[PDB]
């Protein structure tokens, strides 16, 4: 390895992945298999790539003393074991879901997804981001307005009104 120098290094880089970062996910990894790497790196073949890293650096004293890149509320985000997930290029969307549906398949605990940076706070996995470049959800979102929400109430009596 090395000393204080190797230390700072991993941080400034790992933490520039939080400064220049598109997104951030904190996932405790008890019982982490190599299949684990074989996943976020498989979901990197034909859907991601090297635009993502996830260095288990719960070195804390490291990854944390080294977020003077402005990462408050992360002392609370420093408990137990974690595997920092940081985005550089691409949207912040897809990356979150990957773990969301990984850990839910068992694939090691997800630290109840303690949440992370970008919005900046605590725990509560949302779905803002992943619904993007699927704007056909805004095609289906208009709900035909005048027509679909029509053929559902203005036209739902007959199929349920002759009682």
């Amino acid at each position: 390895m090395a000393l204080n120098l190797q230390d700072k290094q991993a941080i400034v880089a790992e933490v520039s992945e939080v400064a220049k970062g598109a997104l951030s996910a904190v996932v405790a990894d008890s019982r982490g298999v190599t299949v684990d790497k074989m996943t976020e790196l498989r979901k990197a073949g034909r859907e991601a790539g090297v635009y993502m890293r996830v260095v288990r650096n719960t070195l804390l004293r490291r990854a944390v003393e080294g977020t003077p890149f402005e990462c408050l509320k992360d002392a609370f985000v420093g408990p137990t074991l974690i595997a920092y997930s940081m985005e550089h290029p691409g949207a912040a969307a897809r990356l979150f879901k990957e773990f969301a549906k990984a850990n839910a398949k068992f694939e090691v605990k997800a630290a109840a997804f303690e949440g992370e940076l970008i919005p900046a706070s605590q725990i509560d996995r949302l779905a803002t981001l992943p619904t993007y470049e699927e704007a056909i959800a805004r095609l289906m979102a208009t709900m035909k307005e005048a027509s679909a929400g029509k053929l559902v109430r203005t036209l739902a009596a007959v199929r349920d009104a002759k009682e």
Partner: protein, 141 residues
């Protein structure tokens, strides 16, 4: 994917499928029928071409036969039909025997589109690079 349950790989060439002398009672003895190893194989083997070595998983439960999901061949045998000698190493690094270049082996690395641990279409280049240097082959990149 899971882990372990049943799978091996012991063949010579697709040119002569389901051989007897080379493997025989060794091609499978756990749930694999020696005669049933010429039906699901050639169903896709004779479907593209025969010649190159083709190993494969041997997913075996307890339902009579077996199910093998095949993929890619050894990128090392691609030096007997698409490079030079009928052999390979023989005389490794005591003399500059064979020599390939950057040009060749390109579309050889291109075929394995579902068999490469490197999303970087460029990184998965130096991987087969060694697969053509395990016998004493210099590279004229």
């Amino acid at each position: 994917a899971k882990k372990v349950q049943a799978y091996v790989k012991l063949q010579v060439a697709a040119g002569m499928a389901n051989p007897s002398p080379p493997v025989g009672p060794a091609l499978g003895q756990q749930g694999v029928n020696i005669m049933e190893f010429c039906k699901a194989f050639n169903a896709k083997t004779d479907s593209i071409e025969k010649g190159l070595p083709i190993p494969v998983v041997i997913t075996v439960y307890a339902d009579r036969s077996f199910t093998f999901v095949t993929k890619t061949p050894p990128a090392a045998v691609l030096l007997k039909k698409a490079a030079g000698i009928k052999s390979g190493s023989g005389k490794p690094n005591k003399d500059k025997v064979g020599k390939i270049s950057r040009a060749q082996l390109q579309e050889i690395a291109q075929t394995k589109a579902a068999d490469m641990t490197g999303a970087d279409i460029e990184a998965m280049t130096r991987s087969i690079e060694g697969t053509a240097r395990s016998m004493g082959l210099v590279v004229e990149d």
